[PDB]
Amino acid sequence: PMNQPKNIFDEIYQETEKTYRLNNIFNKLTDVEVHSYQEYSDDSKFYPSILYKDIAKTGNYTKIAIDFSFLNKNNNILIYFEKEIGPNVRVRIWNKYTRQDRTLTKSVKIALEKGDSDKYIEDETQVRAYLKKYGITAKDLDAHYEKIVNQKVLKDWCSIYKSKYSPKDYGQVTVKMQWEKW
């Protein structure tokens, strides 16, 4: 009552924190696997991480995941996904909702595949050079975000939880997009 969700990301965060030790709400979503990974700050605890199953991934999308950080000072949900954009190169679109300032920050990174390993690139100038090389515009980034975050991840949430929000009306949330002027 005192701390009801103010937007769809609060709703996901709070219902997952309420259920992840008892019977994770995402057990209800058949397209994903639920994982438990060791918390860095408390050796006695695990955080939940959601990974879309291969059956549930489309076209060039290689990964779709939701990580929950409940224990740290900048606690948050992170929804991210990755798509191949050229030979040995993937774009990663990174959408982090920070609880303490009710802010969703959308950003773009690059992964370079060098055989076994990935090398990760986040510096804005380098990222934009890769995007320009492979012809990815800000409008393309919006379309990828709409397709995966709104039409898949958040639509999936609304299929397992009776949301007070929706993929087209997030609620009260400050949205900051790295590529807004690109």
Residue numbers in the entry: 22 to 203
Passage from the reporting paper:
In addition to the WXG100 protein EsxA, we demonstrated that the T7SS of S. intermedius exports three effector proteins named TelA, TelB and TelC. While the mode of action of TelA is unknown, biochemical characterization of TelB demonstrated that it exerts toxicity by degrading the electron carrying dinucleotide NAD+, whereas TelC functions as a phosphatase that cleaves peptidoglycan precursor lipid II. We have shown that TipC1 is a membrane protein with a soluble domain that localizes to the inner wall zone and is responsible for its TelC-inhibitory activity. SiB196 possesses one such tipC paralogous gene (SIR_1486), which encodes a protein with 58% identity to TipC.
In contrast to cells expressing TipC1, we found that TipC2 expression could not prevent toxicity caused by constitutive expression of the TelC toxin domain (TelCtox) targeted to the inner wall zone of SiB196 (ss-TelCtox). Crystallization efforts failed to yield diffraction quality crystals of TipC1ΔTMD or TelC–TipC1ΔTMD complex; however, TipC2ΔTMD readily crystallized in the space group C2, and we were able to determine its X-ray crystal structure to 1.8-Å resolution using selenium-incorporated protein and the selenium single wavelength anomalous dispersion technique. The resulting electron density maps allowed for complete model building of TipC2ΔTMD (residues 23–203) and a vector-encoded proline residue derived from the linker region connecting a his6-tag to the N-terminus of TipC2ΔTMD. TipC2ΔTMD adopts a mixed α/β fold consisting of three α-helices and seven β-strands that fold together to give the protein a distinct crescent-shaped appearance. This shape is characterized by a concave surface formed by a seven-stranded β-sheet and a convex surface generated by the positions of three α-helices. Using the DALI webserver to compare our structure with all deposited structures in the PDB, we determined that TipC2ΔTMD does not bear strong resemblance to proteins of known structure. The resulting TipC1ΔTMD model (residues 23–204) had a template modeling score of 0.65, indicating that the probability that our TipC1ΔTMD model has the same overall topology and fold as TipC2ΔTMD is greater than 95%. We next mapped the amino acids that vary between TipC1 and TipC2 onto the surface of the TipC1ΔTMD model, restricting our selection to amino acid R-groups with differing polarity. This analysis revealed that the majority of conserved residues are found on the convex surface, while the variable residues were predominantly found on the concave surface.
